[PDB]
C-alpha cells in the first residue's frame, strides 16, 4: 500500500508479459484433446490468477478509471470461469484472458497517449463512416 511505487508496477508489467507468453504457447487442440504442456500451463495460470485477483484485493486507497473497471471485469470473469470448472461450455468463457495484454497500453504512458490521440483524431472523419453505412444499407435493401 506504500511500497507500490515503482518496483511493484514493473513486477506487474513483467507478470503480464509472462502471462502473454504462456497464453501464446498454448496449443488449441480439436475436441478436448491436450498434451502435457497444456496441463502444465493450466496449472501455471492458477498462480497468475491468484496474483491478479490479489491486486484488486489489496487495492483500497482508482475505482472510476477506464482501465481499473476492465481489470475488475477480467478478474471476476477469471474467477467465475475457474470456479465453474472445479464443480464440474466453460471453454468459451475462457476467451477473456486475451484481454490481459490490453493492460499494457495502460501501464505504458507512451502507449496511453498514442491510443488517446488515435481515438480522438477520428471524430472529424465520422461523417464518412456514416455515409458508408448509409450506402451499404441502401445497397442491401436494393439487393
Amino acid at each position: 500500500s506504500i511500497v507500490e511505487w515503482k518496483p511493484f508496477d514493473i513486477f506487474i508489467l513483467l507478470a503480464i508479459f509472462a502471462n502473454c507468453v504462456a497464453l501464446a504457447i498454448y496449443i488449441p487442440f480439436p475436441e478436448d484433446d491436450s498434451n502435457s504442456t497444456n496441463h502444465n500451463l493450466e496449472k501455471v495460470e492458477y498462480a497468475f490468477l491468484i496474483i491478479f485477483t490479489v491486486e484488486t484485493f489489496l487495492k483500497i486507497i482508482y475505482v472510476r478509471n477506464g482501465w481499473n473497471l476492465l481489470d475488475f471485469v477480467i478478474v471476476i470473469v477469471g474467477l467465475f470461469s475457474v470456479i465453474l470448472e472445479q464443480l464440474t461450455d466453460v471453454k468459451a468463457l475462457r476467451a477473456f484472458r486475451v484481454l490481459r495484454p490490453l493492460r499494457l497500453v495502460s501501464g505504458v504512458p507512451s502507449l496511453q497517449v498514442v491510443l488517446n490521440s488515435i481515438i480522438k483524431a477520428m471524430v472529424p472523419l465520422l461523417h464518412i463512416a456514416l455515409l458508408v453505412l448509409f450506402v451499404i444499407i441502401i445497397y442491401a435493401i436494393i439487393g
Partner: protein, 158 residues
C-alpha cells in the same frame, strides 16, 4: 599517395567491379550448365581477391582510425570479411547447403556501393533512422493489436 582512391578511374572501375559481382550472382538458374558454375565460382574468387586488395589499399592509405567514421565503411568491411569465410568454408569439411545460400546473399549487398553516392537515398534512410524513435510507440501498439487478435482467434477458432 592519396589520389589513387579519389581518382575518377578508381571509382569507375569499382562500378564495373560491382556490375560483374552482381552479374555473377544474378546469372544463377535451375539446372544451370556446369561450365557456368565454373566460370561463376571462380569469378567470385577473382573478385574477392581484388576487393580484398582494394580494402587493403584503402585501409593503409587513409588511416586505421578514420575509416570507421561512416556507417557504410563498416558495412563494406563486414561484407568483405564475410566473403573470406564463405570462400573457405565451401572448401573445408563444413558443407552447409543452406549456409552456402545465405552467404551468397551477403555478396549481393555490394550493389549498394554504386547507389551510395546518390545524395537522395541517404536522406531517406537518415530520416527514417531519426524518426523511428517518434513512432516506435505506434508500431508497438500495432504489434500489440496483432498479438491480441491472434490470441483471440486462436481461442475462438483453434
Amino acid at each position: 599517395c592519396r589520389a589513387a582512391v579519389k581518382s575518377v578511374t578508381f571509382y569507375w572501375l569499382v562500378i564495373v567491379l560491382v556490375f560483374l559481382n552482381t552479374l555473377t550472382i544474378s546469372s544463377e538458374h535451375y539446372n544451370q550448365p556446369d561450365w557456368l558454375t565454373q566460370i561463376q565460382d571462380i569469378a567470385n574468387k577473382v573478385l574477392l581477391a581484388l576487393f580484398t586488395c582494394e580494402m587493403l589499399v584503402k585501409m593503409y592509405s587513409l588511416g586505421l582510425q578514420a575509416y570507421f567514421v561512416s556507417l557504410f565503411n563498416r558495412f563494406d568491411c563486414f561484407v568483405v570479411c564475410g566473403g573470406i569465410t564463405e570462400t573457405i568454408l565451401v572448401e573445408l569439411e563444413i558443407m552447409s547447403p543452406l549456409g552456402i545460400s545465405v552467404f551468397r546473399c551477403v555478396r549481393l549487398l555490394r550493389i549498394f556501393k554504386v547507389t551510395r553516392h546518390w545524395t537522395s537515398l541517404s536522406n531517406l534512410v537518415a530520416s527514417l533512422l531519426n524518426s523511428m524513435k517518434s513512432i516506435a510507440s505506434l508500431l508497438l501498439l500495432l504489434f500489440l493489436f496483432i498479438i491480441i487478435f491472434s490470441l483471440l482467434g486462436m481461442q475462438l477458432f483453434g
